[PDB]
Amino acid sequence: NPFQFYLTRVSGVKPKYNSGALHIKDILSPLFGTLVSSAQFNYCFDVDWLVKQYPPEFRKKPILLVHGDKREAKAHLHAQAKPYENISLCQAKLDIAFGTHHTKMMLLLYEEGLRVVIHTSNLIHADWHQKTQGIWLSPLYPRIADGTHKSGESPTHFKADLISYLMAYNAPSLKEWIDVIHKHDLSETNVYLIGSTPGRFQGSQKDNWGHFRLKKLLKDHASSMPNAESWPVVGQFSSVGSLGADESKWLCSEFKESMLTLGKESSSVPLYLIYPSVENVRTSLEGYPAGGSLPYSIQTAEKQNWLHSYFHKWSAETSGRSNAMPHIKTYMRPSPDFSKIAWFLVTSANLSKAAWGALEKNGTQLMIRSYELGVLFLPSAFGLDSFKVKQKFFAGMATFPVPYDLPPELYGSKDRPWIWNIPYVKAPDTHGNMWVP
Numbered sequence: 001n002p003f004q005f006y007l008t009r010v011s012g013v014k015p016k017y018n019s020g021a022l023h024i025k026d027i028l029s030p031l032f033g034t035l036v037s038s039a040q041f042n043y044c045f046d047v048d049w050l051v052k053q054y055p056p057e058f059r060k061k062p063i064l065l066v067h068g069d070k071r072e073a074k075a076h077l078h079a080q081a082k083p084y085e086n087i088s089l090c091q092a093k094l095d096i097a098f099g100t101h102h103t104k105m106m107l108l109l110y111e112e113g114l115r116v117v118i119h120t121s122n123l124i125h126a127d128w129h130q131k132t133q134g135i136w137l138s139p140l141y142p143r144i145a146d147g148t149h150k151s152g153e154s155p156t157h158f159k160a161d162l163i164s165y166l167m168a169y170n171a172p173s174l175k176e177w178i179d180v181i182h183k184h185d186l187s188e189t190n191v192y193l194i195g196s197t198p199g200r201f202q203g204s205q206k207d208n209w210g211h212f213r214l215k216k217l218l219k220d221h222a223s224s225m226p227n228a229e230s231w232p233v234v235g236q237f238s239s240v241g242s243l244g245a246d247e248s249k250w251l252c253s254e255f256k257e258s259m260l261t262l263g264k265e266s267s268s269v270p271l272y273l274i275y276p277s278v279e280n281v282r283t284s285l286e287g288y289p290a291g292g293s294l295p296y297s298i299q300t301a302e303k304q305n306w307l308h309s310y311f312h313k314w315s316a317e318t319s320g321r322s323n324a325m326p327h328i329k330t331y332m333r334p335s336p337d338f339s340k341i342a343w344f345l346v347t348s349a350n351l352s353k354a355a356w357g358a359l360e361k362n363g364t365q366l367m368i369r370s371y372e373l374g375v376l377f378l379p380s381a382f383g384l385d386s387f388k389v390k391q392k393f394f395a396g397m398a399t400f401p402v403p404y405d406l407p408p409e410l411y412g413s414k415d416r417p418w419i420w421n422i423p424y425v426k427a428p429d430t431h432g433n434m435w436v437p
């Protein structure tokens, strides 16, 4: 396949639903390359578990953990890593309040070249066990011969864009990885990088990050079609931030406006938001504990009940994953009959202003609180006008593997969004338990 978009392995589904899936042990296997050094960008780490996922012969190679933890949380992570002399740490600066380092990425340096993995899972056992998670695997990038002068750049500008993302950290350990990337040929890359970094961006820099980055790419590299107003927008996520008192504050005013963009020319577009209901979580493989990774709080939700009329259940019969709660985040633009898509994005970014950015200073400044990273699949990057939706995710090449069912199904009148910090004691989960936070 040209897309190299994978799901993680799920324990408990039939083998046909894991045949083309990837576990972290598969990614780090010697079959993918002879490891020299790696960087693990993430939010949550179980270091003992993480080292065990590397092949035994590679467990003493240098590992850099890129994280956002501060104060006692930072101390706890350093304590986890101190037993392993080969592990270094890089604290990403979070100078804007309420920001987090959400980016999930592996940089894998081999004797044979370099690989980049952009994915959605925390580095803990539970995130790779029974969740729906997404992975994009780069090609093996060869080294540019010493003395040869070439860009190693792709038509999607991925090399420059990845270096720009890393430069924003202003960190010495990542300057080393920038120099590694400079030395490799990334020209085969067919995806666009969409990142968020913390800051306040005006002028030219506004288009570098967050939903303005997405808008710029859709303006420049997608085409509008007739009846574009009938092509819905779908967003699918594992948490929701505070979006404001009504849809005009952010969701349908600047966020949807960026997501609607197609082509260079100057709204009733349907918006489908996919987020697990309480019943989805209760009947899941993990049961109610799956809701520990769906951190929508009652404090946030009670100020925006307007939002929940947009919500659709999690359903993923196409990939056998209806009971594997989603920690993947995806956004896409299907046709009115959901048979084609104009683009597809897999990312760490949830439905929040912190992740995507919010306009400030009379619309002239985009403020982002967090680090996020995803990759955008555009038909033009594959010589196509649109992608045909693959009917069965794992079945039998230019059709895009959408991991959940279309059309999405609206919540029923008795359904409620999963809210993690209130109790559920009416009906027990698949393990026999209630939920009492």
Ligand SMILES: O=C(O)c1ccc(C(=O)O)c(C(=O)O)c1
Pocket: 043, 044, 100, 102, 122, 238, 239, 293, 294, 295, 327, 348, 350
């Ligand atoms: O909203 C939060 O507090 C939150 C924190 C961390 C993560 C993560 O796994 O990186 C997520 C998520 O991606 O669902 C959400």
